[PDB]
From a paper:
The mycobacterial FAS-I has a distinct capacity to elongate fatty acids beyond C16, to C24/267,8, which are further elongated to meromycolate (C56) by the FAS-II system and then condensed with C26 to form mycolic acids. Here we report the 3.3 Å resolution structure of the ~2 MDa FAS-I from Mtb, determined by single particle cryo-EM.
A 3D map with D3 symmetry imposed was reconstructed from a final data set of 40,160 particles at 3.3 Å overall resolution with good angular coverage. Out of seven functional domains of Mtb FAS-I, we modeled the six domains that make the barrel-like cage. The localized reconstruction revealed orientations of the ACP which were not observed in the context of the whole complex, however the resolution of the ACP within the sub-particle classes was similar to that obtained using 3D classification of the whole complex. This indicates that the ACP domains are not rigidly held in a single position within the chamber but rather occupy a continuum of closely related orientations and possibly conformations. Negatively charged surfaces are also found near the catalytic sites of the acetyltransferase (AT), ER, dehydratase (DH), and KR modules, suggesting that in the case of Mtb FAS-I electrostatic interactions may also mediate attachment of ACP to the catalytic modules but with an opposite charge as in the fungal FAS-I system. The catalytic cleft of the ER from Mtb FAS-I is wider compared to the fungal-ER, and the flavin mononucleotide (FMN) co-factor in Mtb FAS-I is more exposed compared to the FMN in the fungal FAS-I. This difference is mostly due to the local amino acid composition rather than changes in backbone conformation. The catalytic cleft of the KR module is also much wider in Mtb FAS-I compared to fungal FAS-I. More striking is the larger inner volume of the Mtb DH catalytic chamber compared to the fungal protein. The extended catalytic clefts of the KR, DH, and ER modules may reflect evolutionary adaptation of Mtb FAS-I for producing the unusually long C26 fatty acids; larger clefts are probably required for accommodating the longer aliphatic chains, while the ACP-attached pantothenic acid reaches into the active sites.
Residue numbers in the entry:
A (entry chain B): 712 to 856
B (entry chain B): 2021 to 2288, 2297 to 2308, 2321
C (entry chain B): 2419 to 3061
D (entry chain E): 2564 to 2853
Write the structure that this text describes.
Amino acid sequence: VAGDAEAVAERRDEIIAAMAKTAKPYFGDVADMTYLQWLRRYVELAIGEGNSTADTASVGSPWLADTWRDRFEQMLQRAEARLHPQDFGPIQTLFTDAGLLDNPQQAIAALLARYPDAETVQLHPADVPFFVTLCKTLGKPVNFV
Amino acid sequence: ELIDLVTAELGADWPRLVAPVFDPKKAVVFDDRWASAREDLVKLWLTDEGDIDADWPRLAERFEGAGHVVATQATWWQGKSLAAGRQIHASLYGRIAAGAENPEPGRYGGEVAVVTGASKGSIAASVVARLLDGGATVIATTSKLDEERLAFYRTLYRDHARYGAALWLVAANMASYSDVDALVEWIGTEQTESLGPQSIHIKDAQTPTLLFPFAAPRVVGDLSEAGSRAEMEMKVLLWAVQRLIGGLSTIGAERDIASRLHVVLPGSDGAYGEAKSALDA
Amino acid sequence: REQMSAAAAVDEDAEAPGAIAALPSPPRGFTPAPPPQWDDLDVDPADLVVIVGGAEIGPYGSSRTRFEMEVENELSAAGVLELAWTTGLIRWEDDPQPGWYDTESGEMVDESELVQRYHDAVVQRVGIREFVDDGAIDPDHASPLLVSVFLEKDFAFVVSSEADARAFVEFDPEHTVIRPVPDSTDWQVIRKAGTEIRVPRKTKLSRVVGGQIPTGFDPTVWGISADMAGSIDRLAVWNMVATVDAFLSSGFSPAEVMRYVHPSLVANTQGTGMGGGTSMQTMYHGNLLGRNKPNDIFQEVLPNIIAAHVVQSYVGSYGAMIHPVAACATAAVSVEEGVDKIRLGKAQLVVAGGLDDLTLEGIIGFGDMAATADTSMMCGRGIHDSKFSRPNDRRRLGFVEAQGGGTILLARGDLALRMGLPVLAVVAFAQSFGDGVHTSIPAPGLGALGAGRGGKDSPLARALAKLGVAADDVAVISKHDTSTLANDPNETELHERLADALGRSEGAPLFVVSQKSLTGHAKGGAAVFQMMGLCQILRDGVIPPNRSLDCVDDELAGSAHFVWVRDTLRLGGKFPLKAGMLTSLGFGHVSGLVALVHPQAFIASLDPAQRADYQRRADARLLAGQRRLASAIAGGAPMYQRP
Amino acid sequence: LVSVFLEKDFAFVVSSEADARAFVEFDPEHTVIRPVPDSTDWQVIRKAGTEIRVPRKTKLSRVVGGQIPTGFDPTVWGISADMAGSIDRLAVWNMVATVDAFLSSGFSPAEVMRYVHPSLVANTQGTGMGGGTSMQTMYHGNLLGRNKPNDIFQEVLPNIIAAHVVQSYVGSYGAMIHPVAACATAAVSVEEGVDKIRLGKAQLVVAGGLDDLTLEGIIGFGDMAATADTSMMCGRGIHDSKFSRPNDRRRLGFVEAQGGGTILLARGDLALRMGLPVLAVVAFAQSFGD
């Protein structure tokens, strides 16, 4: 397929099936995702079960890379700044670089406790190129497509 | 030769300090109370019942001089408040209707007052507020008339107005004898504007009774101006106000004899000595 | 001095350690007022005409930004983004990095900085303001002026042929002398005394204030191609913009309508007001100056051909196309003919509306007519630029002209139920009128009260009683109110007569809404402004203010029912609004009434399982429409794709 | 098309100093100013690059058409001379046609007002374009300085034709709808009159429409080229009265004519109750798109 723009959109779904078969899969359609669904899919791809036995950054930190953990904190902070009902001012955020950020499950549940509409409100159309150029940059390459 | 004569004698900025501002096309009339009364009846329904007791006499007494229409609409809101079950609001609208029925003219009935120098947060502004609260016809002068001051005087009227009160608002420099003479001619003879096909009646004719010269001279301090300023402000007090009292006493002279104008002078240790020196001329 | 120096200078600074920015919120659904309460209606939804879509284009752009500036006097972040996208201040590019870029300087703007860096620019570009030329031509071509000089002298010439010289001197030869020049291979005419030559001096009356479209409105950013914008008249361009806005704001395509009904049951009654005044003066100026105008613009300059372009391009409907001209009630008469076509059964989805334009010829003719606001007179009275239009005010001296209009989408309640469509209002009554014998033209019209003959037996009261709306339930009057000396107190008299003809209880208030102070008097496209305003009022519950009012005029004081509003009354669940009344007193003896009822009449007509499924589908379509606008505002996949 | 550039003397007229200054307001960067006290004015003299409009007006002759009878005097009906002078001739023709229809079927609108209420009588005469001759008359008066009335920009509108008809003749308060489709205005006015009667909004509707060919009309239609070219048809050898030949092998476009008229729709109940001459029974009226 590769290198052929029209052939990509021709056999798109076959590529999705083959990547879901292999161990570096695709997302859903990211422009249709909910913020809660977005963060849970990222944690499912990166951490998963806490089951990995290869080259961790330390013991007790489930992230395989510092670029992956600040990837996750920038997605959390844009979820904050996007779902809050204000468009101007600096606002007190959560996630002050702690074990609450080192544990991803309690990080997500602390978001949904404050913002209940993170379960329903879908993703803004300008956060998709944010997410692509966020995954593009200069670190350990990411665990998905 | 003449301009540097005036520069050496009076000052460099003399024509812009003395330049005439007054123009009778820019006079603003604020005599609508029935409309703001109806809108205030609406927003009393919009405000909750918990904050009515905080202003229960004041809200009962704002609607004293109003119309038959405001009375009937107050009874309509009373009926709807009885149907909804707002017992405070029902008695409030009954009180408003009973008060708005009353026809008698107020404390300051027909006292055509002229107040000079009423800015935001000032004693002259509070005097204008109490005169409108009595129900007078106030003529306020001011320096420049723009959007901020227009909103200020409009909210001042719609807050403090009562029975038949009217507020007229003109832009007049209180350091120009041309403006003082034009202002007393305007308060004297009428102003009828005419367009092409027909005419418009604006100002009837007015003879004053009060006078309040609270004219603040100037707030400028970035010029090192004190030598010319120390006589220019003394002009702005003394000869401006006695030219003013001469004109306002003149305009209702031969029409209404035994009708006497009334002046209240303000005197504001050394400032009190300057005030007493301003007095005993 | 010594206890003022201490506290003010050493005032400490405290900044929060978290301190994350604020971003413009993602598109969430509408939050309407808590709806009122009335009983189930025995009316079947086959006998209801509802307003499903609607969009406009005027001095504030779309109806979203116009209503936001109408209520809260300032734009939201989405409105700033929409106007900066529309007026060309911001493009989306992705070659250095995907993001919005500035037009003139080209930098990655931050979403947190959008309002604080672009609010003042769009507030300058948008509103009632001084006439700014957007034709890229010389302003010294179209003005009446008198010249009559007589010339007795030499005529220096150009290289023409002998036949062209002879055809020039065909009219000449009794008033002239002919001399051949072989060096230029022509002749030379030389005319005697009495010969006048046109020496066109073009004057300039400056500072016309008006209600123009936003400066730098680029309709190509919607998706209309450049050759389309160049060849086709700009009224038809605006009509395409408004129509695709209405369909993609209520979440359609016409393809779904063609799936559910036959193409002969869809009509289009967009009667454009005058029809290319700018286009006709462009034709004649190209004819004089020799500009290569197309040789079919005399064919396709006609006012029906605007919506015929709309039919032959976009909707493809075979149905009954009726284009009316009353020149200040075209939208109103198009709406009432669309609704009585639906009352017949001739159609089931009608696209109604109308558009306008002010020309140089328009402003010169209206200045010669002298019922508009004279700029010299109003600046003599000392009124700023944004407050010339002042209806129900003591210092009013004529109307302000604006350009724009739009479209609304009428549909039958059966289609609304079967497709699940967002009902914005329920049309209960739409009607036009004449005025009768008045030979003296400054005598105004009053005969729009024929809708209320008989009291409770009148057809207006009977239609409102069919929908379950009593006489006191009519709450808001969106008056015509052009801010002239004539049409305000008599229209106050007209609504007073309709109120006590319908048998209004004594002292029930009527909220007077008049947004001509906000927009201006777009001539035949004003009823679309009024209907979008009244639909949005019945949605949100708020009442907009008349911000250009200072003192209510005296002779209005006899009206026993009106409430002139000066501040945004936010009626939540405190005072429910159930109906509304428009008027349009058009040019030259024409009047128009149309009532509107809150959409819970439509929700109360049907049965209590289909109402739940209907609310699901309609909310889904509204949300999908506005997030499709958000996808078009950010990424791409533009609106108006042409196969 | 004329474009000549002039570098020479400008002989002038007695104007004021202020009028001369207002003339040379646009000028002063392309010219020289010289005052003349003997004429109490100035004189502008403009350099090279200065173009002057030198309007030559061509003549395409022998247009064949369908005009109104030559010497049609509508004053002989009864319309006054000031009415004919001030009011547009489309509205003049509309008054003629309407009084012809009423006095040919034997009415007055007064009898209609006797038998029904004035809000049940309408007027839906949507005139086709609306004063093309009137608009070019306005602009030619504006250029040449003819003292045109200062309200003709107001009352030039196409609805105002039948609004003159209502404010003068019929006096009906009813639903006035004026449509423009520019070759089916009469048809769409008739179908909107009949479905208003099918509603019950009216019981007597005056429908119709009118047209006019202008010099602008014939020039624009000649540039559009779907009309009959006089040179082509005289090359084919066809006489003056037979250019319009539908369903013929030698047809090459339509012939334009001016006119129109009015018809009077009424409900059968009024027809029976007043005894009116029914000329036809309308069974179906409908418009369509494509």
